Amino acid sequence: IAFPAITQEQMSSIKVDPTSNLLPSQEQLKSVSTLMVAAKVPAASVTTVALELVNFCYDNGSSAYTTVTGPSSIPEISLAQLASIVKASGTSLRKFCRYFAPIIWNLRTDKMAPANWEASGYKPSAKFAAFDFFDGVENPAAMQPPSGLTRSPTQEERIANATN
Numbered sequence: 001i002a003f004p005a006i007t008q009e010q011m012s013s014i015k016v017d018p019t020s021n022l023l024p025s026q027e028q029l030k031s032v033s034t035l036m037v038a039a040k041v042p043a044a045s046v047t048t049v050a051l052e053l054v055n056f057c058y059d060n061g062s063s064a065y066t067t068v069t070g071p072s073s074i075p076e077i078s079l080a081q082l083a084s085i086v087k088a089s090g091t092s093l094r095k096f097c098r099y100f101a102p103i104i105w106n107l108r109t110d111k112m113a114p115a116n117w118e119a120s121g122y123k124p125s126a127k128f129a130a131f132d133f134f135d136g137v138e139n140p141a142a143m144q145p146p147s148g149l150t151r152s153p154t155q156e157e158r159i160a161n162a163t164n
């Protein structure tokens with residue numbers, strides 16, 4: 001017998017929470033905010049302050065070798081510092097941004113397009129798709145805006161980002 005049969009107890013007892021290879025784990029998220037609070041970000045502000053790094057990645061990329069620059073709204077914590085804190089939890093900057101994709105979507109879509117949309121391959125009509133964690137926008141496990149998306153992406157937007 002290769003695998004012993006499962007007992008009924010083992011099946012009540014087994015731990016099966018949804019999983020993702022595209023989002024940081026729950027534990028990883030907790031580490032990031034714990035460390036953020038320790039770094040002196042107010043506990044109330046950790047989400048809004050994270051979004052500052054997310055915004056930066058919306059323009060500049062969220063790749064493991066993207067150069068994060070500039071200050072955050074907390075003195076003596078730069079965006080680069082927050083990025084390091086993110087990496088300290090063992091997730092990547094990309095997965096972390098992806099987790100907040102729907103919020104930054106509501107914040108920037110039809111208001112201020114990715115800064116470099118034209119330098120990347122994009123038609124003006126697919127503009128709002130030109131960030132590297134766009135695939136997070138329609139992820140239901142990603143953090144959601146309080147009243148849902150301001151609109152869905154257009155099929156042109158979905159396609160434009162996939163074909164990149």
